[PDB]
Swiss-Prot record:
<feature type="domain" description="Bromo">
    <location>
        <begin position="9"/>
        <end position="113"/>
    </location>
</feature>
<comment type="function">
    <text>Scaffold subunit of various histone acetyltransferase (HAT) complexes, such as the MOZ/MORF and HBO1 complexes, that acts as a regulator of hematopoiesis. Plays a key role in HBO1 complex by directing KAT7/HBO1 specificity towards histone H3 'Lys-14' acetylation (H3K14ac), thereby promoting erythroid differentiation.</text>
</comment>
<feature type="cross-link" description="Glycyl lysine isopeptide (Lys-Gly) (interchain with G-Cter in SUMO2)">
    <location>
        <position position="41"/>
    </location>
</feature>
<protein>
    <recommendedName>
        <fullName>Bromodomain-containing protein 1</fullName>
    </recommendedName>
</protein>
<comment type="subunit">
    <text>Component of some HBO1 complex composed of KAT7/HBO1, MEAF6, ING4 and BRD1/BRPF2. Component of the MOZ/MORF complex composed at least of ING5, KAT6A, KAT6B, MEAF6 and one of BRPF1, BRD1/BRPF2 and BRPF3. Interacts (via PHD-type zinc finger domain) with unmodified histone H3. Interacts (via PWWP domain) with dimethylated and trimethylated 'Lys-79' on histone H3.</text>
</comment>
Length: 121
């Protein structure tokens, strides 16, 4: 049906926009602290602490499968990245502080993404 096609074209375009957002977020992490999953072989107790691990590579995989239906879903995953980090790592660490900085800088990116998504429909 043409209506199905139109809905698929919208999802594709959202996926495009969310790719640009993901690339911008990742540019705010030059150290690549959040680029890849935490090593379950190297913080061996990680999954006792954190029930829903998240990272940018995992988000890129979901995005390439057109797995985000709306901006809220994508934001949820970015917030997991941040929140998991702030729980596991103490306030005095480079890790906790890198999460705070990313949240602050990424909030700007996500605020404009919300205006574009709303505006474009
Ligand atoms: Na903590």
């Amino acid at each position: 049906s043409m209506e199905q096609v139109a809905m698929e074209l919208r999802l594709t375009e959202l996926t495009r926009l969310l790719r640009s957002v993901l690339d911008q977020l990742q540019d705010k992490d030059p150290a690549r602290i959040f680029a890849q999953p935490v090593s379950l072989k190297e913080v061996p107790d990680y999954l006792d602490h954190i029930k829903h691990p998240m990272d940018f590579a995992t988000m890129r995989k979901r995005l390439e499968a057109q797995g985000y239906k709306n901006l809220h879903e994508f934001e949820e995953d970015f917030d997991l990245i941040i929140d998991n980090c702030m729980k596991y790592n103490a306030r005095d660490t480079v890790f906790y502080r890198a999460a705070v900085r990313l949240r602050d800088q990424g909030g700007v990116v996500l605020r404009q993404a919300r205006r574009e998504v709303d505006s474009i429909g």
